[PDB]
Ligand binder design. Structure first.
Ligand code: A1L65
Ligand code: GDP
Ligand code: MG
Length: 167
């Protein structure tokens, strides 16, 4: 009944939509239209307290706009997703954190770094690299696979805990 607005961001193809659909509907999407941006609702019990997650699965191209800022400003907590087999998506994380800090006008914005696709046998972005960056920013790092569900509940529940600390 308490509602939290979560926003999922990250490079094309990292698994923003797969993460969100795995959480909400307990299955893995092979192909979810990369241009569909929408919010999906899911009720969960975290540390014994029921809440409603209202999760904005972002899409878009690479445009800046104040309009997009308004959508982004609705968020209370942000999942910043890269894929462990996509160096460029890891490189893009700093941009996402900078813009979210700007929109939220705060340096402590509830946020989790998510390294998705951890089911894959070869990573180009090592655990050490991601963990170092998360530690610099003062946010948790959680490895996930939207495919197997490994870490998925942990990533979203951690973000909720981060929000609850923030309030
Ligand atoms: C976070 C954020 C914000 F918080 C507030 C905002 N207001 N307006 C946009 C925006 C964004 C935003 C988003 C919003 C989450 C929807 C997605 C992407 C984005 N993506 C969305 C999907 C995956 C990927 C391509 N398709 N990619 C890039 O690429 C960057 C371009 C500049 O060079 C470095 C990389 N920027 C994005 C972006 O910032 C735009 C930008 C912002 C400021 C300056 C230049 C470019
Ligand atoms: N192996 C693997 N593939 C994944 C994982 N998450 C997403 N994918 C795939 O990566 C592609 C992009 O996922 P999608 O969620 O649409 O990415 P988005 O552009 O970030 O919304 C799809 O083919 C997904 O099935 C994961 O954890 N493991
Ligand atoms: Mg998507």
């Amino acid at each position: 009944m308490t509602e939290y607005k979560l926003v999922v961001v990250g490079a094309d193809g990292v698994g923003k939509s797969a993460l969100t659909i795995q959480l909400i509907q307990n299955h893995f999407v092979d192909e979810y239209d990369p241009t569909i941006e929408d919010s999906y609702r899911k009720q969960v019990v975290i540390d014994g307290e029921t809440c409603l997650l209202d999760i904005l699965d972002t899409a878009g191209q690479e445009e800046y706009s104040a309009m997009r800022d308004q959508y982004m400003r609705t968020g209370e907590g942000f999942l910043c997703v890269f894929a462990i087999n996509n160096t460029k998506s890891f490189e893009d994380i700093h941009h996402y954190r900078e813009q979210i800090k700007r929109v939220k006008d705060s340096e402590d914005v509830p946020m989790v770094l998510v390294g998705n696709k951890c089911d894959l046998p070869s990573r180009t972005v090592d655990t050490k690299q991601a963990q170092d960056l998360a530690r610099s920013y003062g946010i948790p790092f959680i490895e996930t696979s939207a495919k197997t569900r490994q870490g998925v509940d942990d990533a979203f529940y951690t973000l909720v805990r981060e929000i609850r600390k923030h309030k």
